[PDB]
Write an enzyme that holds these catalytic residues in place. Structure first.
Site, PDB file in Angstrom:
ATOM      1  CD  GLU A  23      -3.297   0.429   0.111  1.00 22.24           C
ATOM      2  OE1 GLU A  23      -3.054   1.590  -0.083  1.00 22.24           O
ATOM      3  OE2 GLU A  23      -4.314   0.269   0.451  1.00 22.24           O
ATOM      4  NE  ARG A  60      -5.770  -1.417   9.285  1.00 20.82           N
ATOM      5  CZ  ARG A  60      -5.813  -1.443   7.828  1.00 20.82           C
ATOM      6  NH1 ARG A  60      -4.824  -0.159   7.831  1.00 20.82           N
ATOM      7  NH2 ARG A  60      -6.515  -1.729   7.100  1.00 20.82           N
ATOM      8  CG  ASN A  69      -7.081   2.265   4.997  1.00 20.24           C
ATOM      9  OD1 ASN A  69      -5.472   0.833   5.385  1.00 20.24           O
ATOM     10  ND2 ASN A  69      -7.496   2.137   3.964  1.00 20.24           N
ATOM     11  CD  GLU A 107      -9.691  -4.488   6.013  1.00 20.04           C
ATOM     12  OE1 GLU A 107     -11.138  -4.090   5.331  1.00 20.04           O
ATOM     13  OE2 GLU A 107      -8.554  -4.912   6.328  1.00 20.04           O
ATOM     14  CG  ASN A 165      -7.745   3.500   0.772  1.00 15.62           C
ATOM     15  OD1 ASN A 165      -6.981   3.635   0.754  1.00 15.62           O
ATOM     16  ND2 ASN A 165      -9.447   1.882   0.751  1.00 15.62           N
ATOM     17  CG  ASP A 194      -8.109   0.433  -1.606  1.00 15.24           C
ATOM     18  OD1 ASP A 194      -7.523  -1.050  -1.758  1.00 15.24           O
ATOM     19  OD2 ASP A 194      -7.100   1.083  -0.783  1.00 15.24           O
TER      20      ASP A 194
HETATM   21  O1  LIG Z   1     -10.317  -3.518   3.721  1.00 10.87           O
HETATM   22  C1  LIG Z   1      -8.957  -4.990   2.220  1.00 10.87           C
HETATM   23  C2  LIG Z   1      -8.153  -3.634   2.295  1.00 10.87           C
HETATM   24  O2  LIG Z   1      -9.430  -2.078   1.928  1.00 10.87           O
HETATM   25  C3  LIG Z   1      -8.298  -1.715   0.895  1.00 10.87           C
HETATM   26  C4  LIG Z   1      -6.961  -1.246   2.349  1.00 10.87           C
HETATM   27  O3  LIG Z   1      -6.635   0.013   1.812  1.00 10.87           O
HETATM   28  C5  LIG Z   1      -6.693  -2.035   3.394  1.00 10.87           C
HETATM   29  O4  LIG Z   1      -6.312  -1.459   4.340  1.00 10.87           O
HETATM   30  C6  LIG Z   1      -7.751  -3.304   3.589  1.00 10.87           C
HETATM   31  O5  LIG Z   1      -6.835  -3.882   4.250  1.00 10.87           O
HETATM   32 CA   LIG Z   2      -5.595   1.652   0.791  1.00 14.12          CA
END
Ligand SMILES: OC[C@H]1OC[C@H](O)[C@@H](O)[C@@H]1O
Ligand SMILES: [Ca+2]
Ligand SMILES: OC[C@H]1OC[C@H](O)[C@@H](O)[C@@H]1O
Ligand SMILES: OC[C@H]1OC[C@H](O)[C@@H](O)[C@@H]1O
Ligand SMILES: OC[C@H]1OC[C@H](O)[C@@H](O)[C@@H]1O
Length: 297
Positions: free
Chosen positions: A16, A99, A101, A119, A152, A202
């Site tokens: 990421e 957390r 992201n 998650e 995101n 995302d």
């Molecule tokens: O939900 C699954 C993934 O989706 C994209 C998010 O940026 C990531 O942090 C997450 O773990």
């Molecule tokens: Ca992401």
């Protein structure tokens, strides 16, 4: 002309936050559950990693030297020479299981980053637990809005008057009015509605023409969007489904780097996607991007 190539084969669990550091010709990124910040020197083709003590969801350049990052629910600073990592600010202190992201630096050097409930599987989490924050150059934190599912992708218009933002589980790319001198935002509106086959929006970056590129998690593609019209301009597919984010890099920001994940794939999925978790490069897109901004504190 458009070429998609797998350029770093290290099998990250969830790659990421790619950001190009032109000074070192390196790509920085994270592997979230692996608790590492990575720096890939594209010249020597060597990867260096800084291990951290909680999942790390984004990294950015720090103007005065080194880097900053979002580790757990803390904004942290990193001195690469000594591998020293220290806390600049903390958020969501009233949340048990959140957390950070995605995050990125605005054109005034503020580190924007938002949170999410943690998650148990992809997109399986407690809803509306996140908020969007920014870390100001003086290390104070501004809280913008709450009720976020999964904070995101984000970026800023080239005239610095518009802020673009993705909460992944909203299935839309939104925009706000944005004031450069104060970092304030106003009047959220939907700019693009994701199609079914585009799956979950995302990561996101702007290009030099003011158009937006969005990585589609589970969609195996990046899409190019016109925020002026709300229409899709282009789709580029990749041989991995869990495409997570993108940035421009290389010579004059003419190359796109794409991160992806292998987490959440079953045995069959791993076999169908041998490059899951690797870094891809896309050339020949016919647009360039822009340089990342560096955090000012
Ligand atoms: O939900 C699954 C993934 O989706 C994209 C998010 O940026 C990531 O942090 C997450 O773990
Ligand atoms: Ca992401
Ligand atoms: O109070 C006026 C000021 O409000 C904040 C704006 O960022 C600035 O440009 C404007 O001049
Ligand atoms: O930045 C281009 C456009 O992006 C979407 C915004 O909703 C709109 O107000 C703006 O003009
Ligand atoms: O103006 C404050 C900061 O804004 C972001 C720029 O990338 C950085 O060079 C600058 O110092």
């Amino acid at each position: 002309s458009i070429k998609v190539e797998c350029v770093l084969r290290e099998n990250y669990r969830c790659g990421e936050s790619p950001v190009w550091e032109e000074a070192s010709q390196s790509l920085l990124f994270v592997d979230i559950p692996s608790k590492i910040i990575c720096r890939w020197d594209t010249v020597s083709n060597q990867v260096q990693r800084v291990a951290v003590d909680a999942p790390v969801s984004s990294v950015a350049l720090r103007q005065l030297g080194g880097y900053v990052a979002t580790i757990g629910t803390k904004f942290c600073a990193l001195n690469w020479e000594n591998q020293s990592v220290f806390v600049l600010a903390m958020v969501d202190e009233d949340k048990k299981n959140n957390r950070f992201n995605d995050g990125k630096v605005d054109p005034a050097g503020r580190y924007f980053a938002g949170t999410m409930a943690e998650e148990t599987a992809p997109a399986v989490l407690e809803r509306h637990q996140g908020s969007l924050y920014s870390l100001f150059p003086d290390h104070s934190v501004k809280k913008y809005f709450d009720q976020v599912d999964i904070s995101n992708g984000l970026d800023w218009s080239l005239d610095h008057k518009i802020f673009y933002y993705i909460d992944s589980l909203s299935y839309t790319v939104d925009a706000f009015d944005y004031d450069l001198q104060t970092g304030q935002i106003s009047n959220r509106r939907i700019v693009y509605k994701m199609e079914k086959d585009e799956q979950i929006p995302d990561g996101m970056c702007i290009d030099a023409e003011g158009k937006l590129w969005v990585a589609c998690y589970n969609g195996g593609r990046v899409i190019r969007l016109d925020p002026e019209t709300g229409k899709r301009l282009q789709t580029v597919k990749l041989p991995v489904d869990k495409t997570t984010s993108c940035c421009f890099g290389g010579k004059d920001y003419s190359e796109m780097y794409v991160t992806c994940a292998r987490d959440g794939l079953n045995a069959e999925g791993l076999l169908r996607q041998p490059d899951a978790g690797n870094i891809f490069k896309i050339t020949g897109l016919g647009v360039k991007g822009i340089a990342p901004y560096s955090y000012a504190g």
